[PDB]
Amino acid sequence: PPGPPGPPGPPGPPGPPGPPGPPGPPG
Amino acid sequence: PPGPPGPPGPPGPPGPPGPPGPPGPPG
Amino acid sequence: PPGPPGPPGPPGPPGPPGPPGPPGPPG
Amino acid sequence: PPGPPGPPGPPGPPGPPGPPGPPGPPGPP
Amino acid sequence: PPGPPGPPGPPGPPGPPGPPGPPGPPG
Amino acid sequence: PPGPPGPPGPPGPPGPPGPPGPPGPP
Known part of the structure; x- marks a missing residue:
């Protein structure tokens, strides 16, 4: 028989x- | 035969x- | 016998x- | 027979990391 | 022969x- | 035999969400 997987x-x-x-904080 | 693989x-x-x-853009 | 795996x-x-x-640098 | x-x-491997948390709270006045 | 896997x-x-x-918004 | x-x-499921970020500045 064939072998297993x-x-x-x-x-x-x-x-x-x-x-x-995201953008950095406002200046 | 042995079987196949x-x-x-x-x-x-x-x-x-x-x-x-990547970093976000400036504020 | 069985085939190989x-x-x-x-x-x-x-x-x-x-x-x-990460957030961008401040404005 | x-x-x-x-x-x-x-068991399989662990799953990947969760998503990022929410943004933090606003800064002070 | 062995059983199935x-x-x-x-x-x-x-x-x-x-x-x-990321950080919250400015005050 | x-x-x-x-x-x-x-694979297992994704993990939990991370915590909230830090406070913003003033």
């Missing part, structure tokens, strides 16, 4: 950078 | 989060 | 985006 |  | 807390 |  693959790549932060 | 394993889990975003 | 699965999906960047 | 099923696999 | 394991625990939010 | 163990479970 192989092991899981490696983790995926990192996600992208987050969005820009 | 089993099927591929499942995909790995999701990658880690991305880095923080 | 299968090959590894594929890499997982990308992670989520990172969090927002 | 092949044998009995194997046991359940190990 | 067991079922996938249980889910992992919740992730860690997110980061603090 | 028994088959091998299953693969790992799925």
Whole structure:
């Protein structure tokens, strides 16, 4: 009979950078 | 025959989060 | 006998985006 | 008869971090 | 011959807390 | 004999929200 499934693959790549932060405080 | 190799394993889990975003603009 | 285990699965999906960047500098 | 099923696999990995908290409170007058 | 593989394991625990939010608005 | 163990479970849920940020300035 065939063998069982192989092991899981490696983790995926990192996600992208987050969005820009908010404006700084007013001058 | 021994049987054939089993099927591929499942995909790995999701990658880690991305880095923080860029700084915001000046106030 | 049984076949060997299968090959590894594929890499997982990308992670989520990172969090927002820090606030900009003051005006 | 092949044998009995194997046991359940190990727990998965932790989830990713939660979202950022809300902005802080306003500064003083 | 060996039995089939067991079922996938249980889910992992919740992730860690997110980061603090950004500073509040000026006084 | 028994088959091998299953693969790992799925990832857990996202964590809780972070705390509020600091106070703004005056």
